Amino acid sequence: FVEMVDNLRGKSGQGYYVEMTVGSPPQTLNILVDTGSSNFAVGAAPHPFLHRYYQRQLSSTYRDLRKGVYVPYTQGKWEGELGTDLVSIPHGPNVTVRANIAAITESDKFFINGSNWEGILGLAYAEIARPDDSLEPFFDSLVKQTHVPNLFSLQLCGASVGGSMIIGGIDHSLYTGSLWYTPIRREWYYEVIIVRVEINGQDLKMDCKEYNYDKSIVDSGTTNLRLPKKVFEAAVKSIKAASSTEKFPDGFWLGEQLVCWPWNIFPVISLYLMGEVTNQSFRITILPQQYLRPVDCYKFAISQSSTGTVMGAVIMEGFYVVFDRARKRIGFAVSACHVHDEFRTAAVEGPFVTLDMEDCGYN
Numbered sequence: 255f256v257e258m259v260d261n262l263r264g265k266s267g268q269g270y271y272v273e274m275t276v277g278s279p280p281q282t283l284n285i286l287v288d289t290g291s292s293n294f295a296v297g298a299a300p301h302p303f304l305h306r307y308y309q310r311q312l313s314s315t316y317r318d319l320r321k322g323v324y325v326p327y328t329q330g331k332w333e334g335e336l337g338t339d340l341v342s343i344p345h346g347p348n349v350t351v352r353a354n355i356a357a358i359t360e361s362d363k364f365f366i367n368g369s370n371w372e373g374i375l376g377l378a379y380a381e382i383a384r385p386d387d388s389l390e391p392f393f394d395s396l397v398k399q400t401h402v403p404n405l406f407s408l409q410l411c412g413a414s415v416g417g418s419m420i421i422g423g424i425d426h427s428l429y430t431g432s433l434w435y436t437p438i439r440r441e442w443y444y445e446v447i448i449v450r451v452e453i454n455g456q457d458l459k460m461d462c463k464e465y466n467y468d469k470s471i472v473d474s475g476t477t478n479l480r481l482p483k484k485v486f487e488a489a490v491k492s493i494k495a496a497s498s499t500e501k502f503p504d505g506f507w508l509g510e511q512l513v514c515w516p517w518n519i520f521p522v523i524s525l526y527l528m529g530e531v532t533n534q535s536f537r538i539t540i541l542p543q544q545y546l547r548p549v550d551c552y553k554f555a556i557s558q559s560s561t562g563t564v565m566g567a568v569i570m571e572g573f574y575v576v577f578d579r580a581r582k583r584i585g586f587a588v589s590a591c592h593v594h595d596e597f598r599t600a601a602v603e604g605p606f607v608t609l610d611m612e613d614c615g616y617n
């Protein structure tokens with residue numbers, strides 16, 4: 255997998271992208287890597303923000319599905335035209351597959367002014383694909399048409415960012431210690447169940463259903479750790495208390511302003527995840543180095559949500575994350591590239607005894 259190491263690039267706050275090719279002869283595009291959606295969709299028209307776009311007229315292997323797709327999502331929208339073509343990943347496995355591609359022909363607040371990617375690779379499951387679950391996601395096509403094992407793993411390393419997407423396996427050099435696995439509750443988003451939350455080792459003591467109201471997901475396409483309102487409330491309260499050596503405005507905690515300079519006054523955040531065995535859990539712990547984001551000034555990168563918990567880049571940059579689709583589980587291990595100090599490091603630890611973990615899931 256050496257060839258796949260360092261195959262991700264990005265700019266801070268604009269996501270991680272991987273190089274891909276589409277069509278024959280191959281047209282190179284940079285594509286945003288997104289575990290929180292399920293369509294492969296690429297710019298297909300000369301939008302001013304784009305370095306380049308898919309030109310279907312130049313591809314002998316393009317096939318028109320003669321169907322449109324309309325995709326509003328919470329912070330933007332794209333619309334396009336469905337087709338298939340040959341797709342490969344130059345710094346991925348040595349294969350070429352026929353995949354569904356949505357040629358993006360209209361959009362709003364989707365492309366980022368100044369970014370270096372031209373499309374999105376939705377790595378989640380068919381249940382949330384648009385227009386419906388009959389549009390086979392890219393990764394499903396890749397596994398169906400090749401011998402690539404049904405898993406991928408992400409090391410997001412965090413100004414220009416970098417990382418690794420290991421397609422079809424695990425690179426043990428990218429983590430320390432052991433992987434710990436939590437079940438994929440349902441194959442739609444990469445849905446997981448958080449069974450306990452601590453701030454500096456202090457239990458928030460909420461009914462655990464609240465932690466997963468209405469879901470908890472692992473999402474490379476979200477920057478922040480997003481928490482449901484009631485839990486964000488309780489977590490900010492405890493983090494405020496833990497960091498009371500210095501005072502900050504109410505706006506800072508709501509993302510509305512920055513603060514400038516101090517690590518040790520800020521508490522660690524621990525999420526206990528449902529384990530593989532009955533009544534067994536493990537915990538992942540991140541640092542302020544993960545949830546205080548550079549813009550030395552910083553932004554509070556934990557925010558409230560109405561769509562449930564989102565373990566975005568703030569969580570994922572602490573860990574090597576294994577999307578073990580074959581066994582319906584997600585692995586976490588301490589990342590060999592995460593940012594820390596001489597006093598504290600991100601951790602993955604277990605086993606712990608946790609009862610009633612099935613009650614933590616929302617129905």
Ligand SMILES: NC1=N[C@@]2(CO1)c1cc(-c3cccnc3F)ccc1Oc1cnc(-c3ccnc(F)c3)cc12
Nearest residue numbers: 267268269288290291325327364382473474475476477
């Ligand atoms: N996980 C996630 N993916 C985003 C929103 O959150 C998305 C994120 C970004 C984005 C922006 C900044 C930094 N990182 C990113 F991934 C850009 C476009 C974008 O575009 C999207 C387009 N469609 C979806 C989508 C559509 C239908 N069902 C879904 F579940 C998700 C999601 C997204």
